[PDB]
Amino acid sequence: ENYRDIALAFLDESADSGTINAWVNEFAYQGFDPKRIVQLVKERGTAKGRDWKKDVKMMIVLNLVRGNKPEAMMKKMSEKGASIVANLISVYQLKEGNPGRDTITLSRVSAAFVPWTVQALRVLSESLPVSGTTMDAIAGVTYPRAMMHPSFAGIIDLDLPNGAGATIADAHGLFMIEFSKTINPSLRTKQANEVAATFEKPNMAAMSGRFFTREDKKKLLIAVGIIDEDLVLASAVVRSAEKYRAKVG
Amino acid sequence: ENYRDIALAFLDESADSGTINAWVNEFAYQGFDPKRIVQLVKERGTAKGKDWKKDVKMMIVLNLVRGNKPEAMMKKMSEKGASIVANLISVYQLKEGNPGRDTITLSRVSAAFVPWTVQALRVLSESLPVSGTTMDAIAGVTYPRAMMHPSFAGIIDLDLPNGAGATIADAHGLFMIEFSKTINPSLRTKQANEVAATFEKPNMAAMSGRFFTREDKKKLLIAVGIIDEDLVLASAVVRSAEKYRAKVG
Amino acid sequence: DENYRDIALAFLDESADSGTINAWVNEFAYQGFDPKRIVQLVKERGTAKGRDWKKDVKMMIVLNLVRGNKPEAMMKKMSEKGASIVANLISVYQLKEGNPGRDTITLSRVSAAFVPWTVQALRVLSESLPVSGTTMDAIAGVTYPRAMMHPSFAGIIDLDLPNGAGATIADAHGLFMIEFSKTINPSLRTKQANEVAATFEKPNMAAMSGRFFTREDKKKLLIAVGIIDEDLVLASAVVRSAEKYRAKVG
Amino acid sequence: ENYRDIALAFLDESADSGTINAWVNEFAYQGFDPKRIVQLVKERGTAKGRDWKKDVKMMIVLNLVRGNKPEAMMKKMSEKGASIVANLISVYQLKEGNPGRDTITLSRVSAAFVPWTVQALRVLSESLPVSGTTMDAIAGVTYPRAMMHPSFAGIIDLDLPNGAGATIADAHGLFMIEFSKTINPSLRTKQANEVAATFEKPNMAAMSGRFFTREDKKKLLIAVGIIDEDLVLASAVVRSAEKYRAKVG
Amino acid sequence: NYRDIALAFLDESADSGTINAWVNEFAYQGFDPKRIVQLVKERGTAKGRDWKKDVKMMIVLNLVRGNKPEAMMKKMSEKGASIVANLISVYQLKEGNPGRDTITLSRVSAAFVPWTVQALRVLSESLPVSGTTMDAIAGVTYPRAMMHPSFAGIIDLDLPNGAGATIADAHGLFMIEFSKTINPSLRTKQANEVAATFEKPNMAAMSGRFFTREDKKKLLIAVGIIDEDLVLASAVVRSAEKYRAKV
Amino acid sequence: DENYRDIALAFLDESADSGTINAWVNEFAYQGFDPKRIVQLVKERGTAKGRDWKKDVKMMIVLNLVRGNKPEAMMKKMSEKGASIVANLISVYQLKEGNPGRDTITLSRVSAAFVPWTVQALRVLSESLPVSGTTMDAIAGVTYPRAMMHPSFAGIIDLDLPNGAGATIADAHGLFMIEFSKTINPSLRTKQANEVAATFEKPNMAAMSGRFFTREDKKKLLIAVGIIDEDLVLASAVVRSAEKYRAKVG
RNA sequence: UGUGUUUCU
RNA sequence: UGUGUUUCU
RNA sequence: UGUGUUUCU
């Protein structure tokens, strides 16, 4: 009878904006942060006197065609290329996976510098783990090259009008199942929705990231041809999207 | 033919629908008792010489921005914040998921102390998994910040005149479908009505809660702008409600 | 000695005493689940505590129909008013959580032994059951007989009813049993119908072939609850539910 | 080579159907030898100073009412009965299922000593998994109690004049389909012909058994009322037979 | 430098005699029908047996009971078990995991396949997979000669017009059924998954060199798989397309 | 500190010359092994143990031609004499199997690095190969060039020969490669010829695109082994095998 | 949701 | 490719 | 046949 009144008294209990926001800052998620990624890449690069921006491009291209394990890939590479990778590992302190807060990986570089990643994909389509022609056969259309990497999720605005964001996410999901199957063979026998379950949680975290503003994402999506000035989706996107919904439904 | 004739006689023994339904309601599943929650919080808090009212606020904010998994959220948190979460776990014996009624979770604190939860939402709406700006885009209007958590269902009086309670419930459902879609991304490809069915049962239990009286709920709904002293729904609420009904059917 | 054919043949003239044989049968017979023992123990333990034990049976059955078979567990997810009642029921009847022995009482056992009342409560509780009546109504093409919506119904099935009526009733009950088995055991939800059926048909057969109720007892029960009429004609809902079951499992 | 020539010349080597079929019959699968069973029972029984003939009777009755799983049936039995079953397992080395021919099971005892089994059935027909009253309802008449066990097949002479053996076999099948349906409830929803196929093979092997001669079988069938001294079938047998054929096709 | 070293191997000696001696040292050594027949003949004559008759009995034994003689005696009439006991004794039959000098029933059936392939015409209904079962799986009456793994030993994959490939396909139709019956864990698996369990030792059998190509041609004709003009029997080509469709 | 968001967005309008990027792709491209490194390690490890390493190369090649690329496994089915020397070769050359790093020696890589000898050994032991020369003679309409009867032959193919003669030689080699792939991997036997060709397209291309040997080196090799004459004219059997291949594949 | 997984040549 | 796997009655 | 199994909210 008084436990009810205790709870009810919290109506008049102080909800100080300042103290609440300080708690939020203490409790907030701390780990993956594109801000931290670019900061560390820039710092470590300039400390060794590198053209660090050029190193980013090379690290992204390296990531797009070889994956996320630099030490391993050197053992299966020409000496000319391996020597370059050896340096990239040295200055940027590249790890093979299981990243911590201050850890830099090739995936993280591709994700943080996605506005360039999304441009390189237009050129590398046939050298990717899943080729563009393979995706072109899976979709009924020429699949948008910009989407052919997990990092694309970072520029998706889910709140675009008329469910455009959802449709873009669907179309990207079509690539993600194929990508997930190629780098994890144990998923190749699994159903579409089972494969989707393996990526949709970190994928959602990427799409709901706040590194880029909504206007940043809109500009990126337009610049790379997913959507136009009038926010109209390209047909390849909507047709790839319905393929995805059919597979998982 | 003695013990057999006894059991056989139960055919003519009474099965009154009203008497049976009374038992069903007694024996019905109950996730937790809010009354027991505020009791245990106050008891365990004072026993350690803590400003337990302040700890309630912190646990609520922690719940709003990080969810209901205390041990897991510390693995991705600033050292400062994780330190105080560790304390809260210690003194309040915080567990995760859906344990017994004598067990405290962050989710249950926000539900039991909802008259404060509902005020904190007015402050940190942009730090939620689903932001206030997102809800503003989904509804045609500014979505009432107080509704932006499952614990809001606890202050809903379904027996308000003219089905105003059902309207408020629908307006809250507009948020709940979006919230469910991000914390459980597998639901993103499901129809709105299918998503609504995933939280129908616990949401109903919260609205049907008798911890707060109808007058208590009425006062809460007025104090937070859902309804006025004349029991008239805010325009944004009726808007969000009809958006919801059109999504669901 | 070593002519073994003649040894076996001589057992023709060997004594087959009815008295001694029946005594062996009594020693060797199955001993475990016994509705007679259940009702006896419920009645004894109830009157020893001065309870309206018949009313306790109804409450224990309703408790079983809506919450399942684990009383200690369900108290942790129940109002204090209800939990206090359950606490008493556990105390006087010595309710266990499962793995019953010969002298063990469980909620399932109460529902099974006192099935002539269980079968009446189901008419009223249909929407509060783990599998609702409306859910079964959608699975069958018809309004599924509420009386069958519990495993204990198998105890009143007479498999020897003329014209395979008993088999048809068992089929219709099997339609509910797959749904019930899937809800209380999630690991079966991905399995095929006949796989799920394999999980229950052995104890289910033991229930149908039980001898607690006579054939005339079962006939009366089945009529009283609407499965079959005075002329032993099956209700259409039963035969249509039955063919759904045969289709799933075949 | 010359070894190649040797293998090549096997092409010219014969393959007489009669000679080959003789080998098939020799090498054919044999579940157990009844002869070996009565031997081991008498040997192991006398070696422990037991009334082994009496133990045979108990094992048969035990087999008729409890089946073929000695260790399992003791878990649901009176303390008195389980005590003597434990003994029987000890002295006769009882196993379950289908082990080697040098292994005793309760099922094999009832089969080997069928001239007694067939008499016990006349006494305990209401304590069987399928009762005599049940069979009375399935047939239009009183079903011959002697047929109410799979071991009855051991005394069937298939080479009786006018296909009387086949008629007796069909009458026995009327019980066998019901017996199979209760001990293996998964078969309850199967067609009668499908159920009959589940026991066709071992039942045939029992009827084709040559442990007993035709004269031995004839004497057994007469002594138990299946047929008279003039080799005329009992009316209930021909009845049960035509009931069976109509069920099966 | 290193390039010139490699390039100099052009003028390095490739002596025919020494190379062939290395080949002989390095060559596969294990399963060899020559060794099988040699050992069967030697061990048989050392005990004064009609060893050729023993081969037939061992093959028939293999076709209807499988590859585990000690085990099958425990489920056999005393008359038959006594015979098997002798066969085990003189030929030193093992239960599996054969070494170089090991004789198994499978090995007898494989080495003496020109007789094995004749016995199958007679035993079709006593096989683990019956002829009528294979007749229902194929749309036609499946060639009895193919209803055993040992048939692969007489397949000439180099027969003109892909006839050899077609014969191998038709045999593959039986092999999936046979593999499923003796290994229950494969019964839930897809056709190509089951095929993967046998196609490696199966290929070793087809590419064996015990029989010449003309030996195989003669065998395949004698047993009706193909005719004098090397035309395939329709049952073979129809069984083959069933197999290709499954996998 | 700094904007960071702007630094990232800046990369949208950051350069992306196709030629500069493609140069990086070729540097960073996957490389199975370096033939140069292989002959180095063979000579170094061989001399360090006082061995006729040139002779060991020959034995390892012959071993590779008749037994494949799994040294530990092949010893389990080999004469005691042969297995004894294989054990040595594994020891001094540190032989591994499959596709390990570029600093690792395999039998397959020895045959590839020392292909000017491999190509001569094939002329001698063609009937001891997994696919025999007589088999290839039946598949082609003519006597199939023995020098092509191994994947390592691709290492001496000059694709930039005039009149697409390089492509013709590659196709003629492909006639063998489909058959070789079908026997070492019997699962491919039921696949279409074009599907089989796709299984070895990538490593075969890498071998032909190898720059370990110069065009003049390849030309001299191809002439010395009869694929082409001093006037760069294809042998008739090669053009035959090539058109057989194209008709199989499409 | 917490941004992971990085196969084969 | 390396010639294996041998179920249930 | 041996009368078991009792999920998630």
Author numbering:
A (entry chain S), B (entry chain X), D (entry chain V): 4 to 252
C (entry chain W), F (entry chain T): 3 to 252
E (entry chain U): 5 to 251
Paper text:
The RNA-containing N crystals had 24 N and 12 RNA molecules in the asymmetric unit, which were arranged in four almost identical hexameric rings. In agreement with our ITC data, only every second N bound an RNA molecule, whereas the central RNA-binding cleft of the neighboring monomer was empty. In all 12 RNA-bound Ns of the asymmetric unit, the 9-mer RNA occupied a defined position in a positively charged cleft at the inside of the hexameric ring, where the first and the last residue of the RNA could clearly be distinguished in the electron density. Tyr32 stacks against the base of G2, while Tyr32 of the neighboring subunit stacks against the base of uridine 9 (U9). In this way, each second N sequesters seven ribonucleotides, while two overlapping nucleotides are bound by neighboring subunits. However, the amino-terminal arm of the RNA-bound subunits is considerably displaced against the N core domain when compared to the apo structure or the RNA-free Ns in the RNP. Every second N monomer was laterally displaced relative to the neighboring N leading to a staggered assembly of the hexameric ring. In this way, the six-fold symmetry in the N hexamer was broken, resulting in three-fold symmetry of the RNP. However, the simultaneous binding of Lys204 and Lys79 of the adjacent subunit to the phosphate backbone of the RNA led to a 45° rotation between the subunits, with Tyr32 working as a pivot point. This domain movement created a new inter-subunit interface of 480 Å2 at the outside of the hexamer, which did not involve the amino-terminal arm.
